Design an enzyme around this catalytic site. Sequence first.
Site, PDB file in Angstrom:
ATOM      1  N   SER C  34     120.591 -59.267  72.624  1.00 38.81           N
ATOM      2  CA  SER C  34     119.380 -58.572  72.279  1.00 38.81           C
ATOM      3  C   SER C  34     119.022 -59.140  70.956  1.00 38.81           C
ATOM      4  N   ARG C  35     117.970 -59.979  70.922  1.00 38.57           N
ATOM      5  CA  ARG C  35     117.654 -60.761  69.756  1.00 38.57           C
ATOM      6  C   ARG C  35     116.889 -59.902  68.788  1.00 38.57           C
ATOM      7  N   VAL C  36     116.321 -58.773  69.283  1.00 39.36           N
ATOM      8  CA  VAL C  36     115.624 -57.799  68.477  1.00 39.36           C
ATOM      9  C   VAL C  36     116.677 -56.894  67.874  1.00 39.36           C
TER      10      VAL C  36
END
Lengths: 116, 116, 169, 85, 168, 253, 120, 265, 48, 120
Positions: C34-36
Amino acid sequence: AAVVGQEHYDVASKVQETLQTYKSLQDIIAILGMDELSEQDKLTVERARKIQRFLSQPFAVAEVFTGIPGKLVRLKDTVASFKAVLEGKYDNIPEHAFYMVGGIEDVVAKAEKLAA
Amino acid sequence: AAVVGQEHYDVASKVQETLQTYKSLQDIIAILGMDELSEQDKLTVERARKIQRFLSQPFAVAEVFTGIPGKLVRLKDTVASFKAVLEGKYDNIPEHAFYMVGGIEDVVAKAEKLAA
Amino acid sequence: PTNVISITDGQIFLEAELFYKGIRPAINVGLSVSRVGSAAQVKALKQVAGSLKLFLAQYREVAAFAQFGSDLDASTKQTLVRGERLTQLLKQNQYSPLATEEQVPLIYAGVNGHLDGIELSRIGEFESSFLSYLKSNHNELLTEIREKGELSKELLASLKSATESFVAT
Amino acid sequence: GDRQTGKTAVALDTILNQKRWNNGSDESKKLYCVYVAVGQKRSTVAQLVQTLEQHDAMKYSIIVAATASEAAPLQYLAPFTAASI
Amino acid sequence: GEWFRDNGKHALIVYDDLSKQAVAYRQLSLLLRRPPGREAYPGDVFYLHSRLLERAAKLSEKEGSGSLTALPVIETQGGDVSAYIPTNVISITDGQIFLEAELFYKGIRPAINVGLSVSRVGSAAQVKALKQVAGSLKLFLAQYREVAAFAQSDLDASTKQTLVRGER
Amino acid sequence: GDRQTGKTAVALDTILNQKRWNNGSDESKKLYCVYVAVGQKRSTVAQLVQTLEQHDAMKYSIIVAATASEAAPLQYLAPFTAASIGEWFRDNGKHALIVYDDLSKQAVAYRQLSLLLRRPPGREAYPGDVFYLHSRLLERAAKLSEKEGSGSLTALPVIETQGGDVSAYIPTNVISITDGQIFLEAELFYKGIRPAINVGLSVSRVGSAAQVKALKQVAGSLKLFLAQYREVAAFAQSDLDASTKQTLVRGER
Amino acid sequence: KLQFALPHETLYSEVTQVNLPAKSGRIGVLANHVPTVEQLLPGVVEVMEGSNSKKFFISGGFATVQPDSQLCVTAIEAPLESFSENIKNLLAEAKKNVSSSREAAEAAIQVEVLENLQSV
Amino acid sequence: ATLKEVEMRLKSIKNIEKITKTMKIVASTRLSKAEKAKISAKKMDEAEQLFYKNAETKNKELIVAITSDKGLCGSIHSQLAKAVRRHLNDQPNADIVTIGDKIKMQLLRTHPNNIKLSINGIGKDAPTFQESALIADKLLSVMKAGTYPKISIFYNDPVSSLSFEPSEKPIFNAKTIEQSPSFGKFEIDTDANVPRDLFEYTLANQMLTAMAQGYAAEISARRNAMDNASKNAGDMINRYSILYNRTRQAVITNELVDIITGASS
Amino acid sequence: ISYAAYLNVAAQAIRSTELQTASVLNRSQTDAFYTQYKNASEPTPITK
Amino acid sequence: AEYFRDEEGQDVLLFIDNIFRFTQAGSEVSALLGRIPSAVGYQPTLATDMGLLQERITTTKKGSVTSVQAVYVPADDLTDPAPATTFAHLDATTVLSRGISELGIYPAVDPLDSKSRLLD
């Protein structure tokens, strides 16, 4: 667990997990013997070897080609048969006993044949 | 060598060798373990793990992705601190006391923190 | 797949072997990102699950060594024991949504090592029962997790007390 | 991940937990869920809508469909018009 | 190079790197719509490379002894030596020198792995003095390679002597 | 099976055995056998011919030839034409045999044609209509009913496995058409089992309702038994049960 | 015939006269001697095979003439020459050690060893 | 890819092959010293047996067992586990002294109560008088070994240089020694305490020999095992190599076809 | 103390001229750890 | 060779160098001719071209062209199509090893590896 019921699903779940383990350690087994595996696992492996053989059920009309008279097992019977095997009830008798036979009762009988 | 300074180069060469040794020994460790692995080799492995986590150093813009303000460590300070580690002047410092922190001043401070 | 991976801000990789292993969801954190990140993670759940990733990462390395045998030291087997319980903790039964207020306790219990106290097979029983115990007793606590959505010192202590009380059971 | 292996099911679970807010109030804490099904058999879709009706979640679900039979242009057009919805 | 060679002198031409030469020819060929070939390189890339590399030679005394030594450089694309452009060049060349990444990392500079380095003319044009004092050196190093795996307990003294000699 | 594992010899022996059948009188007990030689050296075929004439078997057999030299379109048309010759015997009711050696080389021939006809390359670069060719060829050989005169044309097509792996497009396509396969194991051939008939990979479908009752009674369950021997020696390599040991001893004999 | 055997050596396996120091004083064996078991105390030992004589330093063990005239001697380590003053320096330390303190018994054994050492 | 995942896995197998080869060799070297020691030790033991035989010494059973701490010493650990279990049915109450961890784990399962003592540090070291003596000394003090009117020790007799059969022998008690025959042909008065001393001395002497026999069998087993491992690894190498080569060709073909298809258009 | 412990101590002492080989000296030292069990329940592994 | 065989009646021996490079050369000519390159690059006309080459090489009743060819395996992969096509033509194989020459055996012919199909 709903569609074919929880008991069926639980029984199937354990078979799948056991067999997946057996496939997983298949590498390790080849690289170093089965007596070089962990003891707890070694029980699982031995059980799985039985399960694999158990899956056989002589062909019901290609009985001719196989040369072994067919076997047909009820679904209700099947759940019972596997349930017992998972509880290791009938695990104490040869792989040959579980090999090319039908239901759980047949395995027991085939042990008697082998015993002779 | 000359271009980045002879000391800087030598220190960094030593780091590379130490890490490279750890990586080569990683395979040995996989089966054999540290059990029949040499004491000298073990000290090199231990240093490599310490160095490995001495690399770790948060980023200020990864306070979002961590929450620890980053470290901007002067060039001279990095050369000095890494040299010490290789010499084993800080092999009396826990492996995790190198992790996610700045220079030697932080690494020692984090040793004390873990001690407390 | 390569093209899409670039476009997307996350991956939720499912491992086939782990599906058969009975982990459903069969997600593997090695290929799930989850790059966020945890900017989308609720504050309470962020606090409890802080090192859950670290524990799992440690479990993975230790577990790899363990398959290639060699008598694992107690520190590694602590990891191994924690990790095993975590794996069972992850498991879920399809078509069973769960309330976040009641996901925060389970992760708290695990991370605060209370579940290492309970045998692997009956972890699933323990989770269910633990929720029942909280429903009976610390239902005030559950209300707070819903209402305030961040675990204060008081909530952490309350939750800790609740878990400890149920460790015996 | 590997096909059909709860491929639909992992996603469907997400839709289902958004029921909890949806049933509830505060529209900014609600989501509306649009499930787009491309290339799938009518029977699969029918099971999905049955599942959704069982979980009584077709009070907020939109199902945009382009079944396996349906034309390749309509399939190409299907994500972009789902996006519009 | 030919001018020097033709004048009877000697010279050394180092083609660095023919791997990039291949790509440029590929760009031309594909754009000229000539059929593609192995590893998407044009088919007559062999003919080109061989043609280039056979203009390096040690000319007879009729031709005034002159020569043009050559040393083509090929860049290994992830160490894939089975790759089409490497395989072709390897066939054409009379020897190869094979540099290994591990050695570079292990600080050995030159990082030439002399295991897979071979010269097919080799000692024919070696200094006589140096030939004498280094036949042995090849053999010692060969043993050092075998005794490499002995790096990890109870180990024969003979191997340990070799290991010491080899490391030094 | 694998190339030049005396591949030809296996078939040749069938022809030889049916010498005394062909010295027979009952026309049912006559196999008029066709050896189709595709893609083989003119020399090797000539040696084969001389071999056949040494066993004086030539007079009951036909040889069709499309040697290695012979052109690819001729090679393409070589099995189909041969099967026509076979049909005259078959449609005279009389029993026959046709050995198509090697249809794998015919596959290469059709591949050449297809590419030179610039039809797009198929799977494994072998054209996709290769299946149609083989299936059309193979199904023209059959046991026909008494109404049709009890026609018989037995087919034994010879496939040369690539790397001895039966998974492979040309082999699998053939396997699906045929009603049984007779895979031969290279390892066993090398390890001096001549003939080297792998029984792990030899199957037959309705073959088990054509043999004489004597060879059903005497040989009963021996196939099962040696698929217990295979297993027995599979896991022989710790402690052997007396039953397994007995089986291993029997298996070895 | 002497069977002199040790967990790492075995210097004898006919030995004519053996003179031994045992928990019974000193015993000498010449040809057929009575077939006995005797505990060997830490010793200065002589073994003679013919007239040729070999001096042994013996760490205690057992001596047993067997009724088949096999003088089975088992001891932990052996020659007299190996004995040769660092042992005296260590024994001084060992005397000190008893003052503070198994160690009490050990230091007592060290005093016994000092006697055995003096015997050389 | 397929190609790379094959290749890396094949590299793993290659590395395994290399390690199993290396280990097998190191084991052989180590084995030579182990065996050398064992001869001298065994000769010493036989001299004690000379007394016991002629004495006809013939002795709650005690069980002692010996395995290394170290693993992958063939099936020494588990052949011994099975044969101990058989005589733990023959004494379902026996106090087990397990010399080394490996026999301890398996045996511990079969009767946990019966596990009374276990040792460690055995396997790392090669048998030495100090270890045997100390284990014996602790056997007397801690386990009160003399009280048990039967003692039995289990070890692995290295039957042949490529085999090991787990074996046992009975450690004789001082009471048995007293009343066993051929007194006078071995004299004792009362001014010696030879039963009570000889019992102790041979408690250790037998144990050291047993340890030597076991250790040699263990290192031998490890060599044998690592040799058989190399063979199995080789087979997997060959299988994945054929796969590697085929996979490599297939990639080339599939890519080539794609370019051709495009070019045709 | 036990008779064989007495002989053991004596043997260890007896390896002292100092000119003696390593194998004797190795035979005169041990690093083994005497684990202690009972009824499974373990008294702390005192060094052997 | 054919002038020798046919028109001088001789048995002759014709060396060919790499037949890999014969194949390789043919593969290029195919590509130049614009023909669709068949499996693993190798020309679709690969089989036929070898066939012509190795059927002109044959034993006549005038003479015989015996041919020794050098087969330089492509990457040591015998699974490749070009070696397979070659092996069909080959009647015997002489398998020299450099290991064997290093055992001081000249001929360098590896005895175990040598095989012929006219060893019947």
